[PDB]
Structure formats: C-alpha cells, structure tokens
Amino acid sequence: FYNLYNFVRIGRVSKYVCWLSLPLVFQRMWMKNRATGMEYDIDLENYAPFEAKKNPMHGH
C-alpha cells in the first residue's frame, strides 16, 4: 500500500477527484439497510411487483 499511495502523492488531478465517487459507496451501504426492512403496502406489491416474473404487462 505504501508504494501505491506514494504514487498517489505524485499525481495531480486523480488524487483529488477519484475519491469523489466514494461517498456513493456509503450511500449504497445506508440505502440497502433502509430497504432490508422497509414496510410496504401488500396491495401495491401484489398489483405492481418490481421485476417479478410472469407479469403480462411486461410481456411475459
């Protein structure tokens, strides 16, 4: 790791930009846990299930 970060030290633009995509990782970490237990309406899930198979409105 010291070699890699000693080279990051020598960069000019990537060392100040390539980290800005990292908050997005924590965004996913938080939203996934929000979604693991989200309470939803049974009627909408049975009427409009997301990416469920054999939905004729999709085609199959």
Place this chain on the structure above:
Amino acid sequence: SLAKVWMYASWIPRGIPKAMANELSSAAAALAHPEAIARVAQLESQGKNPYRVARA
C-alpha cells in the same frame, strides 16, 4: 493447544479491519510530511499521546 484454537477462531474476526488499518498507516507514512511523523515519534517517546496533542 488452546492458543492455536483461539488463533484459528479469531483469525477471521481480527483480519477484517487489518486491510484498512494497514492502508491508513501506509498512506500516512507516504502522504504525511516526515517532520510530522518525526514529531509523532518524539511525543510518543515523551510518553504523550500525539493525537490528543494535535487536537488540543
């Protein structure tokens, strides 16, 4: 022995943060100014916590 059992049991827990820890240590050794690292070593030789010193 029991020590080997504890080693092989705590291997997987103990090693989950070792990557990030070594990454931060190495990135500090690389990116940080060596005068700051020398001051840290000095303060630790003086029995002080250099992180608390820096915060203060």
Place this chain on the structure above:
Amino acid sequence: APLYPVLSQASLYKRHFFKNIKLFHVVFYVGAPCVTFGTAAWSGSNRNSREAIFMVIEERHGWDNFKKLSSHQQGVIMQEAAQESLLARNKGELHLP
C-alpha cells in the same frame, strides 16, 4: 494520655473533604446538571412533548392501534405529531392558553 477515642489523621483528612464544602460548590455544581437535564431544558421538553404527541395520536390514530404498529412507524407518527403540536396551527402558532 487522651481518654477519648482519638481519631486518626487520615479519618480527619477524609472528613475534611465532606465538611469543607462551600455554598457555591453545591449550588452551581448541582444546578448545571439540573438546569440542563431538568424541567426547563431536556426532561421538560421531552416529557411535555410526549403529552402532546400522545394526545394527537389517540385523537387521530388511537393508542391501541399505535401500540400494534412497529417501532419505526410509531416513531414516524410521533414525529408527525410533535411537528403538529410545535406548529400549533390552531393557536396561531403560539404556545399560550
């Protein structure tokens, strides 16, 4: 040859800690946690927002149904009720009688 139960030096050293208090040493040291975590700031705010929250809940949703829901939806409705009460749209936004 003292005929009384002579008290050791260390026992007096310890009792001096207890009897060498001044008035301010009690007043301010006990008033700071008290004023912060008292009927004015924290405990009062909490315990008086709860009353309005559960008034709103039992009027709008019901206490039994509220008990049946989850802790998350419980907290959601509690926060909505706290907002409804803090706003006080009917009192002209004024917490007065």
Place this chain on the structure above:
Amino acid sequence: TGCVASFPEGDVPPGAVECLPGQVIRTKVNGEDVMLEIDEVDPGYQVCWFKPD
C-alpha cells in the same frame, strides 16, 4: 535548521527525520540555494536530520 548526522544502523532516535537514498533536501550552502539528493549511503550507517529539539 539543526544538523545532519551519520550514525550506525539500528534504532532511529525519536524525532530525527531519516534521510534515505533518494531523499531530496532543499538547503542553502554557502549562499547557494541547492537541492541535495542522497545517493549510496554507506552500509552499517544511516543519516538523519536532527532538529535542535
């Protein structure tokens, strides 16, 4: 400020800044602003910058 000193290899004194081969040093030598690049420190020896502290 301070001094640069050569001393035998081993434990580094706490507070000294190691000056290994490949280390660049901006200094002023006889009024001349210069860069000193360390190259081929001898074996059994190492170099460090010792501030006055």
Place this chain on the structure above:
Amino acid sequence: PLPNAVVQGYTSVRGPKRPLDHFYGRTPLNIDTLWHWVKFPHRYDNLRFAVCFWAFLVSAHFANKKQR
C-alpha cells in the same frame, strides 16, 4: 438598604473564625482538588477507537440480521 451589621457580618463584635486545616505532608482533599487523583482518560484512547469500531460493526450486523 441594609444595615452595616448585615454587611460586615456582626452587630457589635467581630468573632474570630477558626482557620482551615491543612494536613501537612499531603495534598489537600476538596471537591475542587480531585484532578490530582482523577485526570481525563488518557490510557485507553486507541483501545477506545478500536472498541467503538467493533461495537458499531457488531451492532450493525446483528441489527441487520434481525431486521431481515
């Protein structure tokens, strides 16, 4: 507003006050002299960092498993 007796603390005669004891050969022990014995925590700060990390992580693990 108030008579001089209340201000000076006596009506007629100023009474002597017994001075404070010192306990020679050792530190004073008062409500304000306790930092001599109890400093701010300084010994287990890095362990505090580690334990905070592990507590957060283990709590998140078991909470997510329970929720799922």
